Design a binder for this molecule. Structure first.
Ligand SMILES: O=C(Nc1c[nH]nc1-c1nc2ccc(C[NH+]3CCOCC3)cc2[nH]1)NC1CC1
Length: 286
């Protein structure tokens, strides 16, 4: 267990969907040699949010995979989540800064790694509901892990989707059509969101070309609030889609579009996605 009082703040790391994450030193000997860790805490520690956060903790805790940020422990008073600190930040920021000097062999290594993290997630009947480069952490040049399980849901035994009311703030531009119209979330809607993560990676996080900027362009920048969703549904219903990023290999663009399939059952599995992505990296390499 970790004791609250030995956590020494160093710096903020970031805010996610409902909390905050700090860089801290667990230094129980006060001589300043202790382990640097990542720490999550609730900004608005409601009784509602406190349940979801402990639910979040219990999900992370139960997930052990090379491509899923490690759980280390909790602190009691209100709860704090202790996690491994990954020094390179979010993939969104790392790729944005180091643009294009990250070649395609690298993007596909991360892609592969993302796929495997999700395949295992799904093996435990969990649905992330927020797969996005900003929620993916970089350990080092050669490793990313999936993180921020704040919006994750377990499937019921006999259902294969999870229907949510009442929705909080929602990454709509990553949402598959049936999540927007019906609030059905599933392994399949995470696969849709994975297609957008792949789009993100191959745009190198150019800000003019992000999903929000581009979907907003397509439906009209004049669309506001609730209407954005109305027009997005219609757009997606008619095969309005994010364009192929400048320079994107062709068989990477096909993976994107296969994921963004209105027909829910016709989307690839992560098992097939991981195989496919690894196959492309083989031939690139030779
Ligand atoms: O849980 C989170 N992340 C982490 C778990 N373990 N380690 C992290 C983490 N988040 C980071 C955010 C930014 C940075 C970059 N800075 C590191 C120190 O020098 C300046 C740049 C690292 C992060 N590690 N992500 C929340 C912050 C969005």
């Amino acid at each position: 267990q970790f004791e609250e009082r030995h956590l020494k703040f160093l710096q903020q790391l970031g805010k996610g969907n409902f909390g905050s994450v700090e860089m801290c030193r667990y230094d129980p000997l006060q001589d300043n040699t202790g382990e640097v860790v990542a720490v999550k805490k609730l900004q608005h520690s409601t009784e509602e949010h406190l349940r979801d956060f402990e639910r979040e903790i219990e999900i992370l805790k139960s997930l052990q995979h090379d491509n899923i940020v490690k759980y280390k422990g909790v602190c009691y008073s209100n709860l704090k989540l202790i996690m491994e600190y990954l020094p390179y930040g979010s993939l969104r920021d790392y790729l944005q800064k180091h643009k294009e000097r990250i070649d395609h062999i690298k993007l596909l290594q991360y892609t592969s790694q993302i796929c495997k993290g999700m395949e295992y997630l799904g093996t435990k009947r969990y649905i992330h509901r927020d797969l996005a480069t900003r929620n993916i952490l970089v350990e080092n040049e050669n490793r990313v892990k999936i993180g921020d399980f704040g919006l994750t849901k377990v499937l019921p035994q006999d259902k294969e989707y999870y229907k949510v009311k009442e929705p909080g703030e929602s990454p709509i531009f990553w949402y598959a059509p049936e999540s927007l119209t019906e609030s059905k979330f599933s392994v399949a809607s995470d696969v849709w969101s994975f297609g957008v993560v792949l789009y993100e990676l191959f745009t190198y996080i150019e800000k003019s070309k992000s999903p929000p900027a581009e979907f907003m362009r397509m439906i009209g920048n004049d669309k506001q609030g609730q209407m954005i969703v109305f027009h997005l549904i219609e757009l997606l219903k008619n095969n309005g889609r994010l364009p192929r990023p400048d320079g994107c290999p062709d068989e990477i663009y096909m993976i994107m579009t296969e994921c963004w399939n209105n027909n829910v059952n016709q989307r690839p599995s992560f098992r097939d996605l991981a195989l496919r992505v690894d196959q492309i990296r083989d031939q690139m390499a030779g």
